[PDB]
């Protein structure tokens, strides 16, 4: 089952597959059988779903055998399985939307501690694999903290989030 | 009958539309009698699909028919 990882605010593109290369009808449905977008011939409609204003597609490439599902401003609340229904198949993919950041926005000093906040989608076990230019490649679960925060810790730390062998990079704000 | 330069008016006689709407809703009730039928407007999309469109006299009329499918319906008017 195809799985994708979002950054809780970026865009996502859900692509199906086809071979007949004629832009045949297609649909997207969640795990609860809810329509989000829609196709009636060659037009593009948006069904009464929570993702009415976020769904997007590449219409010019419909005749080339693609129907990528572009969604803008990804949020954790939209993580659900979606199904491709081009002709007779039920191809299914999943999205995992979460957010990684830090609690201390700007107020920081030398010799202080640092903590990270991770909000994973309901029903996920993300792992935080921090990577730092100074060699502080912290490894841990969803929540990770740093006991030292000095001037040498300058620069945004890239604490990646990995799960199911799929990993996405992130940045950490550090101002002192 | 719809007539009229970006403004025009279409006519709908509720006195004759109500009968057809009632027949259609009554027939729909058979398929799902346990359900309560509620109408509404479109969910959004292309301007040629969400709002009614037609080609008349070399003109591409787009008429907004929202105030005809939003009202809910029941066994009584």
């Amino acid at each position, epitope marked *: 089952k195809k799985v994708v990882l979002g950054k809780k605010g970026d865009t996502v593109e859900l692509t199906c597959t086809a071979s007949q290369k004629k832009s045949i009808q297609f649909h997207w449905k969640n795990s609860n059988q809810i329509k989000i977008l829609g196709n009636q011939g060659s037009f593009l409609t948006k069904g009464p779903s929570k993702l009415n204003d976020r769904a997007d597609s590449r219409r010019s490439l419909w005749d080339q055998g693609n129907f990528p599902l572009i969604i*803008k401003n990804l949020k954790i609340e939209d993580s659900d399985t979606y199904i491709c229904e081009v002709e007779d198949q039920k191809e299914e993919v999943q999205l995992l939307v979460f957010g990684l950041t830090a609690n201390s926005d700007t107020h920081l000093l030398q010799g202080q501690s640092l903590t990270l906040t991770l909000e994973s989608p309901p029903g996920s076990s993300p792992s935080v694999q921090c990577r730092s230019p100074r060699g502080k490649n912290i490894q841990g679960g969803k929540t990770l903290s740093v006991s030292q925060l000095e001037l040498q810790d300058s620069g945004t730390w890239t604490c990646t989030v990995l799960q199911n062998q799929k990993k996405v990079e992130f940045k950490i704000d550090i101002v002192v | 009958n719809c007539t009229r*330069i*970006r403004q025009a008016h279409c006519n709908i006689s509720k006195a004759r539309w109500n009968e057809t709407l009632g027949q259609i809703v009554a027939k729909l009730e058979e398929q799902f009698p346990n359900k309560t039928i509620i109408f509404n407007h479109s969910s959004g999309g292309d*301007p040629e699909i*969400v709002t009614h469109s037609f080609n008349c006299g070399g003109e591409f009329f787009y008429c907004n028919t929202t105030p005809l499918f939003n009202s809910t319906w029941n066994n009584t008017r």
Partner: antibody, heavy 103, light 112 residues
Framework: QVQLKQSGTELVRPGTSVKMSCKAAGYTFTGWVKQRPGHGLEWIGDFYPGGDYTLYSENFMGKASLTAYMQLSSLTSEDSAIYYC???????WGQGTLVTVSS | DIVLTQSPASLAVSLGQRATISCKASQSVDYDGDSYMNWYQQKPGQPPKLLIYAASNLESGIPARFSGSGSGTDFTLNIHPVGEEDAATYYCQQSHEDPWTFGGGTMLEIKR
């Protein structure tokens, strides 16, 4: 009724980036213009929501990064002017936002 | 780019008379019978208002007094009869191809 509404008056410092917004109503959400005295009207660029397509004139590359929004970078005294939002196909333009580039 | 030249720079017309403004393009704009020229009117404190589009048709809400004629690289915007409210700056713009350029402007003064 096709309607577009822009943000209020803005006063920003040179060298920074200032972002304006234009709202819409009465049609499907899915053009920018600059007017300066002695210059007339200059069509800045065009963009398309629901896919975010970009298009610029020769004198706007790297200067602008565009409910829709616009962001003008490398602000200078020349950018002090009024700006109009206009949904492209320009049927209607925004009322106008006055931007003053000064410290 | 397509360069638009307007004429005259300043125009004064008595109330009720005919006001004509010419716009010339550096390149041919006709595309098999159609001209993709636009003419806009602007007044202080207001955004430009589409007066003429397609070079031969009247925009909705625009009085029929405004009209357009010509072809090739020579077009004319004509106002007849001219009124007090007509005081404004008229601009000619080209939609023949990108980049989408604009005219030099032409102020209309209601001589009284």
């Amino acid at each position: 009724q096709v309607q577009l509404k822009q943000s209020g008056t803005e006063l920003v410092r040179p060298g920074t980036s200032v972002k304006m917004s234009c709202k819409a109503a009465g049609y499907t959400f899915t053009g920018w213009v600059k007017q300066r005295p002695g210059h007339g009207l200059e069509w800045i660029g065009d963009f398309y929501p629901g896919g975010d397509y970009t298009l610029y004139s020769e004198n706007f590359m790297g200067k602008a990064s565009l409910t829709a929004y616009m962001q003008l970078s490398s602000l200078t005294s020349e950018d002090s002017a009024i700006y109009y939002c206009a949904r492209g196909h320009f049927a209607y333009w925004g009322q106008g936002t006055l931007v003053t580039v000064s410290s | 780019d397509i360069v638009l030249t307007q004429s005259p720079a300043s125009l004064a017309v008595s109330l009720g008379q005919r006001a004509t403004i010419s716009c010339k393009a550096s390149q041919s704009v006709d595309y098999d019978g159609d001209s993709y020229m636009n003419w806009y009117q602007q007044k202080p404190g207001q955004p430009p208002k589409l007066l003429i589009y397609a070079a031969s048709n009247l925009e909705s809400g625009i009085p029929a007094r405004f009209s357009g004629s010509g072809s090739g690289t020579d077009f004319t915007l004509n106002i007849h009869p001219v009124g007090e409210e007509d005081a404004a700056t008229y601009y000619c713009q080209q939609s023949h191809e990108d980049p989408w350029t604009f005219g030099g402007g032409t102020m209309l003064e209601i001589k009284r």
